[PDB]
Ligand SMILES: CN1CCN(C(=O)c2ccc(-c3cc(=O)c4ccccc4o3)cc2)CC1
Protein backbone atom coordinates (compact mmCIF):
# COMPACT_ATOMS: atom_id res chain seq x y z
CA UNK A 1 0.00 0.00 0.00
CA UNK A 2 2.97 2.37 -0.20
CA UNK A 3 3.26 4.78 -3.10
CA UNK A 4 6.18 7.19 -3.65
CA UNK A 5 5.41 10.62 -5.14
CA UNK A 6 8.33 12.58 -6.68
CA UNK A 7 8.70 16.20 -5.63
CA UNK A 8 9.86 18.78 -8.13
CA UNK A 9 13.03 20.76 -7.26
CA UNK A 10 10.87 23.84 -7.86
CA UNK A 11 8.49 22.78 -5.05
CA UNK A 12 8.92 24.68 -1.72
CA UNK A 13 8.57 21.34 0.03
CA UNK A 14 11.54 19.89 -1.93
CA UNK A 15 13.53 23.01 -1.10
CA UNK A 16 12.85 23.00 2.66
CA UNK A 17 13.71 19.29 2.97
CA UNK A 18 16.96 19.75 0.96
CA UNK A 19 17.91 22.72 3.19
CA UNK A 20 17.47 20.67 6.43
CA UNK A 21 19.53 17.92 4.83
CA UNK A 22 22.32 20.32 3.75
CA UNK A 23 22.38 22.60 6.78
CA UNK A 24 22.67 19.75 9.30
CA UNK A 25 25.92 18.20 7.97
CA UNK A 26 28.69 18.36 10.52
CA UNK A 27 32.18 16.92 10.87
CA UNK A 28 32.39 13.58 12.65
CA UNK A 29 34.87 12.44 15.25
CA UNK A 30 35.80 9.41 13.14
CA UNK A 31 37.31 11.70 10.49
CA UNK A 32 34.79 10.30 7.97
CA UNK A 33 35.50 6.57 8.65
CA UNK A 34 31.85 5.52 8.79
CA UNK A 35 29.97 7.92 6.44
CA UNK A 36 32.76 9.26 4.29
CA UNK A 37 34.40 12.63 3.84
CA UNK A 38 32.09 15.49 2.72
CA UNK A 39 30.72 18.93 3.54
CA UNK A 40 27.52 18.73 1.49
CA UNK A 41 25.38 16.43 -0.64
CA UNK A 42 24.16 16.26 -4.20
CA UNK A 43 20.41 15.72 -3.73
CA UNK A 44 19.14 13.53 -6.61
CA UNK A 45 15.51 12.95 -5.64
CA UNK A 46 13.06 13.65 -2.82
CA UNK A 47 9.93 11.50 -2.70
CA UNK A 48 6.94 11.74 -0.40
CA UNK A 49 6.13 8.36 1.15
CA UNK A 50 2.35 7.73 1.13
CA UNK A 51 0.78 4.85 3.03
CA UNK A 52 -2.70 5.38 4.57
CA UNK A 53 -2.38 2.48 7.00
CA UNK A 54 1.12 3.44 8.24
CA UNK A 55 -0.04 7.06 8.58
CA UNK A 56 -3.11 6.16 10.59
CA UNK A 57 -0.95 3.87 12.71
CA UNK A 58 1.37 6.81 13.46
CA UNK A 59 -1.51 9.29 14.16
CA UNK A 60 -3.24 6.83 16.51
CA UNK A 61 -0.12 6.44 18.60
CA UNK A 62 0.50 10.17 18.40
CA UNK A 63 -2.92 10.85 19.96
CA UNK A 64 -2.18 8.33 22.75
CA UNK A 65 1.15 9.99 23.56
CA UNK A 66 -0.35 13.46 23.32
CA UNK A 67 -3.09 12.57 25.78
CA UNK A 68 -0.50 11.25 28.25
CA UNK A 69 1.45 14.56 27.90
CA UNK A 70 -0.95 17.52 28.28
CA UNK A 71 -1.96 17.48 24.60
CA UNK A 72 1.62 17.70 23.38
CA UNK A 73 3.02 15.02 21.06
CA UNK A 74 6.41 16.82 20.99
CA UNK A 75 6.69 15.96 17.32
CA UNK A 76 9.95 16.43 15.44
CA UNK A 77 11.28 15.88 11.92
CA UNK A 78 14.44 13.79 12.17
CA UNK A 79 16.71 11.66 9.95
CA UNK A 80 17.10 7.92 9.84
CA UNK A 81 19.72 6.11 7.79
CA UNK A 82 19.55 2.34 7.41
CA UNK A 83 20.23 -0.63 5.20
CA UNK A 84 16.56 -1.51 5.79
CA UNK A 85 15.01 1.61 4.25
CA UNK A 86 13.01 -0.52 1.81
CA UNK A 87 11.39 -2.49 4.67
CA UNK A 88 10.60 0.78 6.47
CA UNK A 89 8.79 2.52 3.64
CA UNK A 90 6.61 -0.55 2.93
CA UNK A 91 6.04 -2.01 6.39
CA UNK A 92 6.90 0.94 8.67
CA UNK A 93 9.15 0.93 11.70
CA UNK A 94 8.79 -1.98 14.13
CA UNK A 95 10.68 -4.00 16.78
CA UNK A 96 12.85 -5.72 14.12
CA UNK A 97 14.65 -2.37 13.77
CA UNK A 98 15.64 -2.14 17.49
CA UNK A 99 19.38 -1.42 17.71
CA UNK A 100 20.49 -3.96 20.33
CA UNK A 101 23.97 -2.46 20.72
CA UNK A 102 22.78 1.15 20.81
CA UNK A 103 24.02 3.40 23.61
CA UNK A 104 20.50 4.20 24.81
CA UNK A 105 19.22 0.62 24.72
CA UNK A 106 17.37 -1.43 22.13
CA UNK A 107 15.32 1.18 20.30
CA UNK A 108 15.04 2.93 16.99
CA UNK A 109 17.51 5.82 16.57
CA UNK A 110 17.03 9.18 14.81
CA UNK A 111 19.32 12.18 14.33
CA UNK A 112 19.09 15.95 14.01
CA UNK A 113 22.34 15.83 11.96
CA UNK A 114 21.72 14.33 8.51
CA UNK A 115 25.41 13.37 8.46
CA UNK A 116 24.95 11.25 11.64
CA UNK A 117 22.20 9.21 9.90
CA UNK A 118 24.49 9.02 6.81
CA UNK A 119 26.92 7.02 8.94
CA UNK A 120 24.35 4.18 9.05
CA UNK A 121 23.15 3.96 5.43
CA UNK A 122 25.52 1.08 4.74
CA UNK A 123 25.15 -0.40 8.22
CA UNK A 124 26.59 0.01 11.73
CA UNK A 125 29.88 1.93 11.44
CA UNK A 126 29.23 2.27 7.72
CA UNK A 127 29.54 -1.56 7.34
CA UNK A 128 31.73 -2.40 4.35
CA UNK A 129 30.51 0.70 2.48
CA UNK A 130 28.65 0.69 -0.82
CA UNK A 131 27.55 -2.68 -2.32
CA UNK A 132 29.31 -1.89 -5.62
CA UNK A 133 32.75 -0.52 -4.60
CA UNK A 134 33.04 -1.52 -0.91
CA UNK A 135 33.73 2.16 -0.19
CA UNK A 136 32.22 3.89 2.86
CA UNK A 137 33.21 7.22 1.25
CA UNK A 138 31.86 6.35 -2.22
CA UNK A 139 31.10 9.49 -4.21
CA UNK A 140 29.46 7.63 -7.10
CA UNK A 141 26.80 5.39 -5.60
CA UNK A 142 23.34 6.69 -4.77
CA UNK A 143 22.47 6.69 -1.09
CA UNK A 144 19.08 7.00 0.63
CA UNK A 145 17.99 8.59 3.92
CA UNK A 146 14.51 8.92 5.49
CA UNK A 147 13.33 12.27 6.87
CA UNK A 148 10.80 11.17 9.45
CA UNK A 149 7.98 12.55 11.56
CA UNK A 150 8.73 11.45 15.13
CA UNK A 151 6.61 11.57 18.26
CA UNK A 152 8.91 12.13 21.30
CA UNK A 153 6.28 12.75 23.98
CA UNK A 154 7.93 13.18 27.37
CA UNK A 155 11.58 12.52 26.57
CA UNK A 156 14.18 11.22 29.00
CA UNK A 157 17.31 13.41 28.91
CA UNK A 158 20.61 11.52 28.74
CA UNK A 159 23.65 13.81 28.94
CA UNK A 160 26.44 11.96 27.07
CA UNK A 161 29.81 12.04 25.32
CA UNK B 162 12.77 -3.78 21.68
CA UNK B 163 13.52 -2.40 25.18
CA UNK B 164 11.05 -0.26 27.08
CA UNK B 165 11.03 3.49 27.32
CA UNK B 166 12.11 4.72 30.78
CA UNK B 167 9.09 4.65 33.16
CA UNK B 168 7.06 7.85 32.73
CA UNK B 169 8.66 8.75 29.35
CA UNK B 170 7.89 8.07 25.67
CA UNK B 171 11.43 8.44 24.26
CA UNK B 172 15.09 9.13 25.19
CA UNK B 173 17.06 12.19 24.14
CA UNK B 174 20.83 11.80 23.72
CA UNK B 175 22.21 15.26 24.45
CA UNK B 176 25.76 15.92 23.31
CA UNK B 177 28.10 16.77 26.27
CA UNK B 178 31.64 17.15 24.70
CA UNK B 179 31.38 17.87 20.97
CA UNK B 180 29.84 21.28 21.19
CA UNK B 181 28.86 21.17 17.51
CA UNK B 182 26.90 17.84 17.54
CA UNK B 183 23.09 18.03 17.51
CA UNK B 184 20.81 15.78 19.55
CA UNK B 185 19.97 12.16 18.78
CA UNK B 186 16.71 10.43 19.80
CA UNK B 187 15.45 6.94 20.51
CA UNK B 188 11.88 5.61 20.42
CA UNK B 189 10.84 2.16 21.65
CA UNK B 190 7.59 1.88 19.67
CA UNK B 191 7.64 1.66 15.86
CA UNK B 192 4.30 3.48 15.64
CA UNK B 193 5.95 6.68 17.00
CA UNK B 194 7.66 7.39 13.69
CA UNK B 195 6.37 7.90 10.14
CA UNK B 196 8.85 7.75 7.23
CA UNK B 197 7.65 10.91 5.45
CA UNK B 198 10.37 11.64 2.84
CA UNK B 199 12.74 9.33 1.01
CA UNK B 200 15.82 11.27 -0.04
CA UNK B 201 18.21 9.97 -2.72
CA UNK B 202 21.64 11.56 -2.75
CA UNK B 203 25.39 11.41 -3.13
CA UNK B 204 27.97 12.72 -0.73
CA UNK B 205 30.19 15.21 -2.51
CA UNK B 206 33.99 15.16 -2.51
CA UNK B 207 35.28 18.42 -1.04
CA UNK B 208 37.28 20.56 -3.56
C1 LIG C 1 18.23 -5.42 13.89
N1 LIG C 1 19.40 -4.51 14.07
C2 LIG C 1 19.01 -3.10 13.90
C3 LIG C 1 20.22 -2.19 14.17
N2 LIG C 1 21.00 -2.41 12.96
C4 LIG C 1 21.30 -1.44 12.07
O1 LIG C 1 21.93 -1.69 11.04
C5 LIG C 1 21.10 -0.07 12.33
C6 LIG C 1 20.58 0.77 11.35
C7 LIG C 1 20.47 2.14 11.58
C8 LIG C 1 20.88 2.72 12.78
C9 LIG C 1 20.80 4.11 13.00
C10 LIG C 1 20.26 5.05 12.12
C11 LIG C 1 20.28 6.40 12.43
O2 LIG C 1 19.84 7.24 11.62
C12 LIG C 1 20.89 6.80 13.63
C13 LIG C 1 20.91 8.15 14.03
C14 LIG C 1 21.53 8.54 15.24
C15 LIG C 1 22.13 7.58 16.04
C16 LIG C 1 22.13 6.24 15.64
C17 LIG C 1 21.50 5.86 14.45
O3 LIG C 1 21.46 4.52 14.12
C18 LIG C 1 21.45 1.90 13.75
C19 LIG C 1 21.57 0.51 13.52
C20 LIG C 1 21.39 -3.87 12.76
C21 LIG C 1 20.18 -4.73 12.82
Ligand SMILES: [Zn+2]
Pocket residue numbers: 130131132133134135138139140141
Ligand atom coordinates in the same frame (compact mmCIF):
# COMPACT_ATOMS: atom_id res chain seq x y z
ZN1 LIG D 1 30.11 2.84 -4.69
